[PDB]
Ligand binder design. Structure first.
Ligand code: COH
Ligand code: COH
Ligand SMILES: *[C@@H]1O[C@H](CO)[C@@H](O[C@@H]2O[C@H](CO)[C@@H](O[C@H]3O[C@H](CO)[C@@H](O)[C@H](O)[C@@H]3O)[C@H](O)[C@H]2NC(C)=O)[C@H](O)[C@H]1NC(C)=O
Ligand SMILES: *[C@@H]1O[C@@H](CO)[C@@H](O[C@@H]2O[C@H](CO)[C@@H](O)[C@H](O)[C@H]2NC(C)=O)[C@H](O)[C@H]1NC(C)=O
Ligand SMILES: *[C@@H]1O[C@H](CO)[C@@H](O[C@@H]2O[C@H](CO)[C@@H](O)[C@H](O)[C@H]2NC(C)=O)[C@H](O)[C@H]1NC(C)=O
Ligand SMILES: *[C@@H]1O[C@H](CO)[C@@H](O[C@H]2O[C@H](CO)[C@@H](O)[C@H](O)[C@H]2NC(C)=O)[C@H](O)[C@H]1NC(C)=O
Ligand SMILES: CCCCC/C=C\C/C=C\C/C=C\C/C=C\CCCC(=O)O
Ligand SMILES: CCCCC/C=C\C/C=C\C/C=C\C/C=C\CCCC(=O)O
Ligand SMILES: CCCCCCCCO[C@@H]1O[C@H](CO)[C@@H](O)[C@H](O)[C@H]1O
Ligand SMILES: *[C@@H]1O[C@H](CO)[C@@H](O)[C@H](O)[C@H]1NC(C)=O
Ligand SMILES: *[C@@H]1O[C@H](CO)[C@@H](O)[C@H](O)[C@H]1NC(C)=O
Lengths: 551, 552
C-alpha cells in the first residue's frame, strides 16, 4: 500500500513516496523540519507560544461590547481590525489551487481543469488498508446508522442565535451559484465553472442561457406581470430549461438563471427579488447615462449586483453568523497593500461543510398557513397566493434550526444527509482530525470532547471506535456548539477562510476594478457601498416590509 | 459619436461618457487629478524627477561590462538586481484582466470569457469619426502601400545581435502555444484557453488529444523510430488531427500537440526535441520512483518540462534578446515577499508585437543545401534527410534578420505582414502614441524621431500625415533600433511586462507549487534549475552538438 497512507507529514509538510514502502516529507516553508515536519524552528516556537486559540479569539469578539462599541465608531480603528480579520485567515487556502478527487499530488490536470471542485486535503489513496488510511476498522460504520443515531431530528431544536427563514433561504440561494454538483460526472465535479460569485444563478451559466433570459431593451431581464406583480418569465416564453415535475402549470414554470430554483418557493422569492433589483439598477443607470445601449446597461448592472451581493454577505449575513460585537466591513481597499490572490477555486469540503439541512423547519409558516415539505416543494402557487410582502414578513418571523449540537436534520431530507456521508466516502475524504490539523486546530482526543455531551458520544464511540477516524460531515452536525451559537469550532474555522476567498477573491475587489467608472460612475458605486438585506427588500418588495436575518 | 473618441483621459485615467456630448475621467490611483488626470500630486512630482528613462536604464545595463561581471558573481547582489527587474515591470499589466475586442468597458463577460484575447488598451469605439478616434484622415492609408514602401525586404538585413535560426524557431515554437488565433471566431479570439506556458503545443489543448498522444506506459508520449532515430508518431497511428496539404504521405504526417507544427520543419525540429525530453524525464522519474504509475509519471514530467521552458526562456532566450551584461535569473522565490498575481491572460497586443517575420532568412541553409520557402514549407523530408544533429549545427550557424529598422519583411510572407496591419484595424487598435503613453513612454513628435532616419519617415509622413495616427505594428518594424540592437524602445517596453506575466504568473511559480515534492523530489527540481538551451539539445540530440541563440 501507499506509504503516505498514515498521513505522516505534519504542519502542512507534503508527503511523497520514495520507494514501495518509504516516504519523504517536504517541509518547505512550514516553519518545521525533521522527518515528519515536527521540530519547530526557533521563530516558530515563539509564534506558537504567543498565538491565541480560536476559542479565545471568539470569546474576545463576543464580549466587551463597550470596547467594541467604541471601536465600531472610530473608522480608522474599525478598518484596522477588519484589515487584521481579513489577513489572519489568508494563509490557510491554497491559491492557486492544488489537489482534487483524482489527484493527491499537484498536476497540470488538477490546476487547469475547472470542472473539478478543488481539495483542501488530498484524497486517501486507493490502496490504503483502511478508509481513513491505516487507522480504525476495515470499514466505516453504516451511514444509515450514523444518520439515525446522531443526525435525525427528534424534536425541533431552534437556533439560539435567532437565525430566521430569510437567512436560511438566502444561504441556499447564494451558495447554489457556486455549489452546483455535476451529477452526471460525480460528486467531485462542478457545473459552476466561474467558481464563485458571478451571479450565474440569476443570469445563467452560459451565454446562450443569458441571452434567452434577457429583454435586450434597457439592459433588462425578461419578466411577466401577474396580478400587477413582477415575476420571472416562463419556460414557454424564454425556452430556458428548468427542472419541474410534469404537473406544474405553464405560468408557474418560472425561468431563472439557476435551473433548480423552481424547487423551493423560498428560492423563487429571492430569484424574483434579485430580478427586480437588476431591472431597478437598469432604470437608474439609464437615467445616469441616456447615451448607453442595452449591452453596457446589462453588463454594468451585473457588476453592481455582484458588488451588492458581496456587501450583503459580509455586513449582514456573515455579521449575523459570527455573533461578533465588532461590525465587519466590505472594503476591498484594506487589501491593496497586502499580498492577496484575486482568484478562487471552490473546494469540495467547502461544499460539504455548507450542507446546513438542520436549518430547515418542520413546516413552512406563511401568514396563517403551515405548509409541510410535501405541500411546499415545487409549489410556486404559494408564492403567488401570499405574495412577496407576506413571504418577507412570515420568514423574518420564523426561526431556523440549530446546525451543530446533534440530532436536528429533519427526516424529510434524510436521503440528502445520508448522501453527504456516502459521497464524502466516495471522494475519499480524510478524517475530521486531519481537517482540524489542516486548519490549525487541536485534534479531538475523545468523542465526548467533540460533542461536549455523553449519549451521542457513546453511540459514536461504538460506531467509529477511534476518534481519529471520525468523519468530517457528521462531526460538524454533532459538534459541541460555541455558547448559545449555531455552529461549533470546526464549522467556523474551516468556513471562514473559504468564505474570505470566495468573497474577496472576486476580480471586482481588485484595484483595477474597484473604481467608480467600473460601475457607471459614483451613482453606481454607491449602490454597492450602501447595499443591505433591508434595502434589497425595501427597494424591491411592495410596502417595504422590515426584514433581517434574525428573529 | 462617443465622447471618449479623442482619448482625453491621461495617465491611465478611465474615460466614461456622461451624456451624448460629455465625458468624465476616473483618476483613481493614477497619482494625477483634474478633468483629464494631468495635474500631478506632490509625491508624483518627486517620483517623476527621480525616474530614469527606459533608454538610460538600457544604456546602464548594456555598458560597464566589468562591473556587471563582478555583480554577476555576488549571489546577493544578483538576487537584489533581479528582484528589481521583476518588480519594476509589474504594475504595467492589468491582472485580473480588463478589456477585449468587444468590451471597451469592464464587464463580467470580458473577465470570464477565456476565448477572448484580452486588451492592454480598449478598442476605438465603433462610431468614432476617425479610425484612431478624432485625429487623422477619414481612412487610414492603404495597407499595401504601407507594406511595400517601408516593410518589404530589399536586401537581407542581418540581426546585429547575432540571433540565429535556433532562436528564430524557438521563438515561433514557444509562442505558438499561447498565440493560437481562432479564425472561425475572429482575430480577437484564441484557442489557447490556458493563456500561457502550459505546453499544450507538446501535450495537446484538450484531454482527448492528450490521451491519443500518450503511450500509457511509464508516463511516456507515443513515438516512432525512423532509421534508429526517435520522431513523433503519425496521424494514422494516433488519430490526432493535424493540418497538412493533401499531397503529404501518411508516413510524413507527424502528430504533435499543436495542429500547425507539421508545416515548418524548424517547428518539427523543436517538437521532436521536446518529445524526447519528456520521455527522458519519464526515465529519470521511474528510476527515482519505481513505485509510481503511468499517470503520475506523465503529470510530473509535464510540470518539470514547464519549469524547464520558463528557465530557458529567461536565462537563455530573454538573456540573449536583452543584450544585458547582467545575468538574468529564474527564481520564483524573489517574488514571495512581493505583491504579485499568479495568473495571466494573453493580450492581443502581445500577439501583434510578436509577429517577428523579419527574423526569417531568404533561404533555409541546411548543410550544403539552400532551401527556398516553397521547398522548405510542409516538407518534413528535409528533417528526415538531414537529421536533428545537422539541423542544430546548421541553424546555430545561420544568422536571422533584424526586426526593427525597416524594410526587412521577406517577400515570401508579404500577405502575413499585410494581415497583421489589416487585423489590427479590424480589431480597432488605438495608435502607436496611445500605446507608448499606456506603457509610460514619451509619444513620438515626428516620423523622423520614430525611425531615426529621413527616407522612410518621409514615406510615412505622406501616408499617415500625423504622427499621432501612426499604427502600432508597422511602427515596431520601422522603429529606430537601439544601438546595434534587434529591437527599438517600443518593442521592448511593451514586450517585457507581457513576458514577465506569462512566465512568472504560472502556478508552478507560486509558493505552494515551488517545492521539490511538486516535481518528484530534489532530482526533479534540479532538472528545472539547471536547464538550458544547450542542455536540452545535448540530452536529446545525437552527438550533443554545441548550440546557443547566437551566431558568434
Ligand atoms: C445552505 C443551506 C441549505 C438549505 C437551507 C437547503 C435547503 C433545502 C431544501 C428545502 C428548502 C431541500 C428540499 C433541499 C434538498 C437538497 N439539497 Co439543500 N439546502 C442547503 C444547502 C445545500 C448545499 C450546499 C447542497 C449541495 C449543492 C450541490 O453540490 O449541487 C445541497 C444539496 C441538496 C440536494 C441534492 C443536490 C442535488 O443532487 O441536486 C437536495 C435534494 N443543499 N435543500
Ligand atoms: C515569433 C516569431 C515567428 C516566426 C519566426 C514565424 C515564422 C513563420 C514561418 C516560418 C517559415 C512561416 C511560414 C510563417 C507564416 C505565418 N505566421 Co509566423 N512566425 C512568428 C510569429 C507569428 C505569430 C506570433 C503569429 C500569430 C499566431 C496566431 O495568432 O495564431 C504568426 C502568424 C503566421 C501566419 C498566419 C497569419 C494570419 O493570416 O493571421 C502565417 C501564415 N506568426 N511564420
Ligand atoms: C476535466 O476532467 C474530466 C475528468 O477526467 C474530463 O472528463 C472526461 O473526459 C474524458 C476524455 O475526454 C472522457 O473519456 C471519454 O472519451 C474517450 C475518448 O474517446 C473514451 O475513450 C472514453 O470511453 C470516454 O467516452 C471521460 O468520460 C470524461 N469523464 C467524465 C465525464 O467524468 C474532462 O474532459 C476534463 N475537462 C477538460 C476541459 O479537459
Ligand atoms: C481636458 O482635456 C482636454 C480634452 O481633450 C482639453 O480640451 C481641449 O483643450 C484644447 C487646448 O486647450 C482645445 O483645443 C479645445 O478647447 C479642447 N478640445 C476639445 C475637444 O474640447 C481641456 O482643456 C482639458 N481641461 C483641463 C481642465 O485641462
Ligand atoms: C465567449 O464569447 C464568444 C463571442 O461572443 C461566444 O461565442 C458566441 O456564442 C454565441 C451564443 O452561444 C453564438 O451564437 C455565436 O456562435 C458565438 N459568436 C462567435 C463565435 O463569435 C462564446 O460562446 C463565449 N464563450 C462562453 C463560454 O460563453
Ligand atoms: C515520524 O513518524 C513515523 C510514522 O508515524 C514515526 O514512526 C513511529 O512512530 C512512533 C514513534 O514513537 C511509534 O510509536 C510508531 O510505532 C512508529 N511508527 C512507524 C510506522 O514506524 C517516527 O518515529 C517519526 N519520526 C520522528 C523523527 O519523530
Ligand atoms: C459565505 C460563507 C459564510 C459562512 C461560512 C461557514 C461558516 C461560518 C463562517 C464564517 C462566519 C463566522 C465567522 C467568520 C468571521 C470573520 C472571518 C471571515 C471574514 C470574511 O469572510 O470576509
Ligand atoms: C515570453 C518571452 C518574450 C520575449 C520578450 C519580447 C519582447 C522584448 C522584451 C524583452 C526582451 C528584451 C529585454 C528584456 C528585459 C527585461 C525583461 C525581464 C523580465 C522578464 O521578461 O522576465
Ligand atoms: C427521527 C429519529 C428516528 C431514529 C430511529 C433510530 C433510533 C436509534 O437511535 C437511538 O435513538 C434514541 C432516541 O433518541 C437515542 O436515545 C439513542 O441514543 C440512539 O442510539
Ligand atoms: C400548493 O399550494 C396551494 C396553496 O397555494 C395548496 O392549496 C396546494 O395544496 C399545494 N399543492 C400541492 C400539490 O401540494
Ligand atoms: C522536399 O525536400 C527534399 C529534400 O529532402 C527536396 O529534394 C524536395 O524537392 C522537397 N519537395 C518540394 C515540394 O520541393
Amino acid at each position: 500500500h501507499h506509504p503516505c497512507c498514515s498521513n505522516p507529514c505534519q504542519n502542512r509538510g507534503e508527503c511523497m513516496s520514495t520507494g514501495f514502502d518509504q516516504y519523504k516529507c517536504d517541509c518547505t516553508r512550514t516553519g518545521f523540519y525533521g522527518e515528519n515536519c515536527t521540530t519547530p524552528e526557533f521563530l516558530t516556537r515563539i509564534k506558537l507560544l504567543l498565538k491565541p486559540t480560536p476559542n479565545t479569539v471568539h470569546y474576545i469578539l463576543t464580549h466587551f461590547k463597550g470596547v467594541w462599541n467604541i471601536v465600531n465608531n472610530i473608522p480608522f480603528l474599525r478598518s484596522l481590525i477588519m484589515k487584521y480579520v481579513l489577513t489572519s485567515r489568508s494563509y490557510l487556502i491554497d491559491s492557486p489551487p492544488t489537489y482534487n478527487v483524482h489527484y493527491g499530488y499537484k498536476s497540470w490536470e488538477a490546476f487547469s481543469n475547472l470542472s473539478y471542485y478543488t481539495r483542501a486535503l488530498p484524497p486517501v489513496a486507493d490502496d490504503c488498508p483502511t478508509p481513513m488510511g491505516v487507522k480504525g476498522n476495515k470499514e466505516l460504520p453504516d451511514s444509515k446508522e450514523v444518520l439515525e443515531k446522531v443526525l435525525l431530528r427528534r424534536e425541533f431544536i431552534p437556533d439560539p442565535q435567532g437565525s430566521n427563514m430569510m437567512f436560511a433561504f438566502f444561504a441556499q440561494h447564494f451558495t447554489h451559484q457556486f455549489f452546483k454538483t455535476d451529477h452526471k460526472r460525480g460528486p467531485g465535479f462542478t457545473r459552476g465553472l466561474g467558481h464563485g460569485v458571478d451571479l450565474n444563478h440569476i443570469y445563467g451559466e452560459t451565454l446562450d442561457r443569458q441571452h434567452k433570459l434577457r429583454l435586450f431593451k434597457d439592459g433588462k431581464l425578461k419578466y411577466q406581470v401577474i396580478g400587477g406583480e413582477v415575476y420571472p418569465p416562463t419556460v414557454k416564453d424564454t425556452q430556458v430549461e428548468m427542472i419541474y415535475p410534469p404537473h406544474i402549470p405553464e405560468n408557474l414554470q418560472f425561468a431563472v438563471g439557476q435551473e433548480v430554483f423552481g424547487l423551493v418557493p423560498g428560492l423563487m422569492m429571492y430569484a424574483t427579488i434579485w430580478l427586480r433589483e437588476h431591472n431597478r439598477v437598469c432604470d437608474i443607470l439609464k437615467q445616469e447615462h441616456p447615451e448607453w445601449g442595452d449591452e453596457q446597461l446589462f453588463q454594468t448592472s451585473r457588476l453592481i449586483l455582484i458588488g451588492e451581493t458581496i456587501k450583503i454577505v459580509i455586513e449582514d449575513y456573515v455579521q449575523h453568523l459570527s455573533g461578533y460585537h465588532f461590525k465587519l466591513k466590505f472594503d476591498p481597499e484594506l487589501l491593496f497593500n497586502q499580498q492577496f490572490q484575486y482568484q478562487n477555486r471552490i473546494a469540495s469540503e467547502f461544499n460539504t461543510l455548507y450542507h446546513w439541512h438542520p436549518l430547515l423547519p418542520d413546516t413552512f409558516n406563511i401568514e396563517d398557513q403551515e405548509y409541510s415539505f410535501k405541500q411546499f416543494l415545487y409549489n410556486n402557487s404559494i408564492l403567488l397566493e401570499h405574495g412577496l410582502t407576506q413571504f418577507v414578513e412570515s420568514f423574518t418571523r420564523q426561526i431556523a434550526g440549530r446546525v451543530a449540537g446533534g440530532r436536528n436534520v429533519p427526516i424529510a431530507v434524510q436521503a440528502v444527509a445520508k448522501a453527504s456521508i456516502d459521497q464524502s466516502r466516495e471522494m475519499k475524504y480524510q478524517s475530521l482530525n486531519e481537517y482540524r490539523k489542516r486548519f490549525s486546530l487541536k485534534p479531538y482526543t475523545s468523542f465526548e470532547e467533540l460533542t461536549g455531551e455523553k449519549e451521542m458520544a457513546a453511540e459514536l464511540k461504538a460506531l467509529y471506535s477511534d476518534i481519529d477516524v471520525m468523519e468530517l460531515y457528521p462531526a460538524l452536525l454533532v459538534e459541541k456548539p460555541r455558547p448559545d451559537a449555531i455552529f461549533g469550532e470546526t464549522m467556523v474555522e474551516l468556513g471562514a477562510p473559504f468564505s474570505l476567498k470566495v468573497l474577496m477573491g472576486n476580480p471586482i475587489c481588485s484595484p483595477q476594478y474597484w473604481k467608480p467608472s467600473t460601475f457607471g460612475g459614483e451613482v453606481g458605486f454607491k449602490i454597492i457601498n450602501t447595499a443591505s438585506i433591508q434595502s434589497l427588500i425595501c427597494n424591491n418588495v411592495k410596502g417595504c416590509p422590515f426584514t433581517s436575518f434574525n428573529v
